[PDB]
Structure 1
Amino acid sequence: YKLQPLTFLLDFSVDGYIRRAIDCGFNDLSQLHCSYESFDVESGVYSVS
């Protein structure tokens, strides 16, 4: 798998080992998830680039 510099939101469980990650670059919803810094964001009309 190719490696590129990316900003990844990281969710850590009780162990602290990474379990869930979000790629901000791929998908509009993922950019919204990076915003608010929450895995799920409240439903709203959100502008995109």
Structure 2
Amino acid sequence: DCGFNDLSQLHCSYESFDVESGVYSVSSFEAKPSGSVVEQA
């Protein structure tokens, strides 16, 4: 399952359960909007 931890993301990216070494993976923990400053007219 890709949506669990970075180790799970690494398996999904390579597409192989037996992932090779080399430090390759999905990057950038999505900084989710802590709040929302909707300030329109």
The runs of 4+ residues in structure 1 deviating greater than 4 Å are: none
1:7-22 mapped onto 2 (5 Å cutoff): none
Q: How many residues align?
A: 27
Shift of 1:28: 0.2
User: Larger radius of gyration, structure 1 or 2?
Assistant: 2
Unaligned runs of 5+ in 2: 29-41
More RCO (CA 8 Å, sep 6+):
2
Shift of 1:36: 1.8
Q: Distance in 2 between matches of 1:45 and 1:36?
A: 11
Gaps of 5+ in 1: 1-22
Which of the residues 13, 19, 23 maps onto 1:45? 23
Q: What is the CA deviation profile of residues 6-47 of structure 1, one whole-angstrom value per residue up to 9, with x for unaligned ones? A: xxxxxxxxxxxxxxxxx1010101001001211121011235
Cα RMSD after superposing both structures:
1.4
2:11 corresponds, among 27, 30, 33, to 33
